[PDB]
Design a protein around this nucleic acid. Sequence first.
RNA 1: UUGACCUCAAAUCAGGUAGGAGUACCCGCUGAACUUAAGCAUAUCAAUAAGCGGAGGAAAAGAAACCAACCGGGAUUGCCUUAGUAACGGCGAGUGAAGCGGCAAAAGCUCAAAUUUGAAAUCUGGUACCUUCGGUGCCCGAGUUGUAAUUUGGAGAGGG
RNA 2: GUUCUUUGUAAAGUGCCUUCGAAGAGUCGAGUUGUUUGGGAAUGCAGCUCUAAGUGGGUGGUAAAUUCCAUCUAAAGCUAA
RNA 3: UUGACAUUGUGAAGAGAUC
Lengths: 51, 148, 99, 193, 203
Amino acid sequence: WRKWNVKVNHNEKRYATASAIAATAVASLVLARGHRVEKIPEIPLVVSTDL
Amino acid sequence: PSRFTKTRKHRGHVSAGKGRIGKHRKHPGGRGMAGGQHHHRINMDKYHPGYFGKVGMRYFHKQQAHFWKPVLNLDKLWTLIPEDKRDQYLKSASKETAPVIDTLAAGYGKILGKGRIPNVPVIVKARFVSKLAEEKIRAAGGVVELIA
Amino acid sequence: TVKTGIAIGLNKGKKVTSMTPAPKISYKKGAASNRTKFVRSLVREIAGLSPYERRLIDLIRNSGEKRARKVAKKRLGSFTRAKAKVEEMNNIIAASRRH
Amino acid sequence: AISKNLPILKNHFRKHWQERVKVHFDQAGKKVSRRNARATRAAKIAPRPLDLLRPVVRAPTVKYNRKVRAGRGFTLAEVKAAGLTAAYARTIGIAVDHRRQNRNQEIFDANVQRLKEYQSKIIVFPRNGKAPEAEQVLSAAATFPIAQPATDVEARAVQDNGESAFRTLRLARSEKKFRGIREKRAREKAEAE
Amino acid sequence: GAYKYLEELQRKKQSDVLRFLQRVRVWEYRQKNVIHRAARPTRPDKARRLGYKAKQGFVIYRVRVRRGNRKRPVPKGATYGKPTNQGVNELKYQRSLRATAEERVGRRAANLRVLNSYWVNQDSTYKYFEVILVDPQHKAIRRDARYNWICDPVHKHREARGLTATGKKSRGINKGHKFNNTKAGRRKTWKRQNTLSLWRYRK
RNA sequence: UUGACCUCAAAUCAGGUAGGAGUACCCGCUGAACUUAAGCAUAUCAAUAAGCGGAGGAAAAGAAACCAACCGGGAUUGCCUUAGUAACGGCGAGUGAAGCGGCAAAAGCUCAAAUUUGAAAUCUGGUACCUUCGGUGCCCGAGUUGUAAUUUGGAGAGGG
RNA sequence: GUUCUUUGUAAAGUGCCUUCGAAGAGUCGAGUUGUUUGGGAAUGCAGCUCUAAGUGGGUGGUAAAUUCCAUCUAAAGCUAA
RNA sequence: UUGACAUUGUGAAGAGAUC
C-alpha cells in the first residue's frame, strides 16, 4: 500500500505536453538531445501525408 | 524521496537528533489524547477551549436533506444568467420583458441580501428569501416569486 | 391535500395535477371474508373461552371495565389490544346472558 | 501525547487494520474484464441492445426533487396506457415496475410519450425465421435521453401586487405552529354549556 | 376445504379441548426416543403450508430438546478474566431451541434435507418439534421442477449454515432500519466497513 | 377362523445416499487476554485470535410487513459519497452507522389458503420391448389424513 | 442454414357488467433476564412467563393516552450477473 | 438455602377478610 501512482492536475499535465510540443521546434534544443538534425531541410519537419 | 530526508544527514551522529539526555522512548505522554484533564490540561485549555462537556439537545436520526438550504447573495444572482445573454438584459432594461432567474435550478435554497444588484428589473424565483433580500430586489423594480 | 404552492406551512410543497389510480388489492388484507366469519363463529362455540377469558367475564360482571381493561392489558400485550378484547367479552356476556 | 497547537484527529486504527487493507491494483485490469464481458454479452444477446427502457421519474426528498431521473420500470398503468400488456413488455425490452404508482399527471404523460416513440422506432423479428439482421445499437439511453423539462420562460412581464414574499413565509410559518392551539382554544369555546 | 377449520382450532391452545390433547400427547412423546420417526404429521395443515406434500420422499421426524438456558461450561465457574465476562448461569445461547432441533435430525439422517419445522408442544423440561425432511436422492423429488431445487448441492445441511426459516431469524435477516447491523449478514458487513480501500490514485 | 387397518420391527431384502480431505475466500456458533485508558474495575482490544459445525466456484443476500415526508422512490449486491457526520461512551480513552445522490450489474418468481367431483385427471418402482441423460404398455404400490390442472395480492376465481 | 415432423375438437392472451376475493399462531405483540448495537424509557438475537386481531397487523428512531394521516402486507419457498 | 411463575390435573376440611 505504498503510494505507487501519482495524481497530476489534468490542466498541468496538459501544460507540460504543450511545452514539449513547442520544444520540438527550436532546433537548438533538439541537438542537445542528440538527434543529428544538421542535414535536415528545416524544422519542424513536415512530410507529405502519403507516409 | 529519502535522499532528501534529514535522517540521511544524521548518519554518523550518535543519537540521531533526539538528544542524549531525554533519549527517545516509546510513549512519554501516553497514547493519543490521554491525560487531557490531568497532565495535558494546560494544553487543552489554550488551543482547545470547550473540548470537555455537553452542549444542547440531541437529535435522533438526523438527515442532511431537510437542512439543505444553500444561499446566494445579491452580490451574484446575475451570474445565473448566460454571459452571452447577460449584457442583453443589462442594457435595454424594461418591464414586460424581464429575466426569469430560477435559483433552484442552480442549486440555491435561499436568496440573501449581501449587496447592490443593479437597477434592472428581474424576476427571481426562490424557495426562501430574507427581509432585506426582497427590499433590494423589489426596489430594483423586480419581484420575488416563491416556489416549492 | 392541495399542496400550498410554497416552501413551508400547512400543506407545503409543489402544486401538481394529480391522478389517484385504483388502489392495490392489498390494503384489503384485513378483509371481512364471509366464509371466515362463518368459520370463526363455529370455532368459538366448540372451543369456547380460555382460562383468562373466564376471568374477564367475572370482572366485567363484578368490577366493571376499568378493572377489566386493566387485567386485559397485562394479560395481552398492550392497551389498544385490551380494548378490543374486553369489547369481545361484553358480546360474549351480553349475547349469552341476556338475549 | 498532546502537544503544540494542532487539530484533534480521530483516526481509527486501534484494531488490527492491516489484515483488512484492500488496495486496488486491478482498477485498470478489471476495466478490460468489464469491457470484455460487455462485448461478450453484446454478441451473445443478438441485436437486443444490452439494456431495457427505464422510465423518466422524479427524484425524492427535499434536496433532489428538482431533477428528473431514470427509474426501474414503467408502472402497469402506464404500460397499459400505451396499448400493450405487462408480460409482453418484458419481451420487447421494456422494464416493468409493478410496485410504483402514478400520483402525477406530467410524469404519466411523459412515460407514455416515451413508450410511443420507443415502439415506433424499433423493429421486432418475426418469430418464424428470416431476421434481416439490423446491426444492434448497443444502448437504449443513447437514443432515449432522460431530459429536464422547461417549467418557465426566460423573459416575461413582472406582476407586482405588493404581496411581500418574505411576509408570506412568516405567516405561513406561524400558522403551522399555532394551528393546534387554535382548536383546543375553540374546542373549549364550543363545549360551553 | 377442511383446512380452514383445523387452522383456527390450533390457535386456541388453552381451549378446553386442546389442553386435553396437549396433555395426552406430551405424555406420548416423552416415552418415545429423543429423535424418532413420525409416521404422519400431527398437524397436517401446519406442515402443508410450510412445503410438505403427502408423497414418498417427504419425511417427518419428532425431536425433543432440553429446555432452559445455556451454562457457559468452564471448570467450577471460574472464567479467568475481567469480571465483565465472569457470568456463568444466565447466558442464553444465540440460537434457538427450534434451530437446535433441526440441527440434531439433520445429523441423524444426513441423506435428507431439512425443509422446515414447527412447534408441536412443550412442557417444563422439554420442547417438542416436528421437522419436515426431504429425500433428494429419491426419484420423486428429483423430477417435479417444484421440489428439485433441494437436490442441488448448495442446499446441503441448510440448518447448520442457517438457511432455514427459523435460522434466518436468528441471523437477524430482514429489510429495514432495524436490521442494519446484520442484514446482508453481520460478519460480511462488519468486514466491509472496516476495510481500508486504497485506490491507485489516492482520493 | 378369515381377511383388512393403524402403528412398531427383522432381513448379507432391491436400489441408493451421508461420513474423510481441502478450508485462502463464504455461512453460522462459541469466545479471550495481552494492549489502550499514562493506575484500574465499565469501556477499548473485539462482536477480533484460538475451539466447533457447513458449503460452493463463488457463497450469502434478494423481489419489500423497504426507504421516506418528496413534484415521492421501488428486489439484492458492490464501488464512489454521505462521514469520521447523526449518535454512543468512568460523554473519559475511545467507538460510529443509514436514507437520499453518481455508478458497475440487472431478472424475476411459485407455494399454503379454492369441489376436477360426469369421473386421482398425479407419482415411485418391478417387468417387456425400444429410437436410451430417457420413451411405451402392462403389473404390485404411494395417495383421499389430498397427488396433478387453475390462482398468489401486481392479482385473481366462478359466471354471463 | 436445410430437412422431417401438424401438434389439437389443445392451450394462451384482450374488453365489458355481475358475484366472490380464501392470503401462514406458543407466532405477532408485551413484560422481564443475559447479550449485543451508533440505537439513545431499551437495535438485533436468545431464554423463561403472558399471549392477539381480521376495514386486521407491522413501521413511521423520546416513554404515554387521545384522535388522524402515510406506508408497505410478517410468522412458507426459489433465483443468475 | 428461600419466595414467585411454569410443569399442574380432581376435591373435600378447618381456621384466616389466605393458609
